Every structure is written in C-alpha cells, then in structure tokens.
Amino acid sequence: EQIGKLRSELEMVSGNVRVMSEMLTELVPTQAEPADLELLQELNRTCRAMQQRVLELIPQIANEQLTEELLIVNDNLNNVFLRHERFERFRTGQT
C-alpha cells in the first residue's frame, strides 16, 4: 500500500518539476510572465506537499520488503532528484 503510494507521489512530483523546468527552458526565467511565474510557484508548492507526503510514507515502510518494489521507489526518487536539479539549473540560468 504505502509502497504504491510512494511510487505514485514521487512520479507526480517528478512530472510537475519536469513541467516547471520545461517552462524555464522555453521561456527565460527573468522574462517569464507573471502568469508563468504564478504557475511555477503553484507547481513548486504542489511538489513540496507531495514530497512531505512521501516523507510521511517512508517511515511506514516496514522491513523487509520486495527488492523489486524498493528499487522502483528508489528509482522514482532519483528521478525527482534529477528533475529538481535540472529545474534549479534552468531557474538560475546555469544550465
């Protein structure tokens, strides 16, 4: 249960962050419109909330579990990390 929740949450996070980074890719962060900035902020807030939900789930994962499922969750977490770093790169114009 909580494992599936971890996957779903992490996937949603990485997706939303991907969107943000793609927005910053297409449009210059400093030239982006107020509307674009609001959208970015909303997506960031959503991601944060979901990340917290993940942090609420991990504790509930008793050991041991299926290696396959654990790897899946870890991979999705790594995907979040990657997308987050990319977002930061584009936002700071250091990409």
UniProtKB/Swiss-Prot annotation:
**In the record, which residues are listed under signal peptide?**
none
Describe the location of the GAT domain by residue ranges.
Answer: 1-89
Tissue specificity field: Widely expressed. Highly expressed in skeletal muscle, heart, placenta and liver.
Quick one: effect of changing M50A? Answer: Reduced interaction with TOLLIP
Where in the cell does this protein reside?
Cytoplasm; Endosome membrane; Early endosome membrane
Outcome following mutation: L43A: Reduced interaction with TOLLIP
Q: Per UniProt, what does mutating E9A do?
A: Reduced interaction with TOLLIP
What is the recorded post-translational modification? Monoubiquitinated.
Q: What role is this protein assigned?
A: Adapter protein that plays a role in the intracellular membrane trafficking of ubiquitinated proteins, thereby participating in autophagy, ubiquitination-dependent signaling and receptor recycling pathways. Acts as a MYO6/Myosin VI adapter protein that targets MYO6 to endocytic structures. Together with MYO6, required for autophagosomal delivery of endocytic cargo, the maturation of autophagosomes and their fusion with lysosomes. MYO6 links TOM1 with autophagy receptors, such as TAX1BP1; CALCOCO2/NDP52 and OPTN. Binds to polyubiquitinated proteins via its GAT domain.
Q: Which disease does the record tie it to?
A: Immunodeficiency 85: An autosomal dominant immunologic disorder characterized by early-onset autoimmunity and features of combined immunodeficiency such as hypogammaglobulinemia and abnormal T-cell function. Clinical manifestations include atopic eczema and recurrent respiratory infections in the first decade of life, autoimmune enteropathy, growth failure, autoimmune oligoarthritis, interstitial pneumonitis, and EBV viremia.
What information about domains appears in the record's comments? The GAT domain and the VHS domain are required for the interaction with polyubiquitinated proteins. The VHS domain binds to phosphatidylinositol monophosphates. The KRKK motif within the VHS domain is required for binding to phosphatidylinositol monophosphates, with a preference for phosphatidylinositol 5-phosphate (PtdIns(5)P).
Q: Which family does it belong to?
A: Belongs to the TOM1 family.
How does it associate, per the subunit comment?
Answer: Found in a complex with TOLLIP; interacts (via GAT domain) with TOLLIP (via N-terminus); the interactions leads to TOM1-recruitment to endosomes and inhibition of TOLLIP binding to PtdIns(3)P. Interacts (via GAT domain and the C-terminal part of the VHS domain) with UBC/ubiquitin. Interacts (via clathrin box and C-terminus) with clathrin heavy chain. Interacts with MYO6. Interacts with TAX1BP1; CALCOCO2/NDP52 and OPTN; the interaction is indirect and is mediated by MYO6, which acts as a bridge between TOM1 and the three autophagy receptors.
Q: What is this protein called?
A: Target of Myb1 membrane trafficking protein
Name of the gene encoding the protein in the UniProt record: TOM1
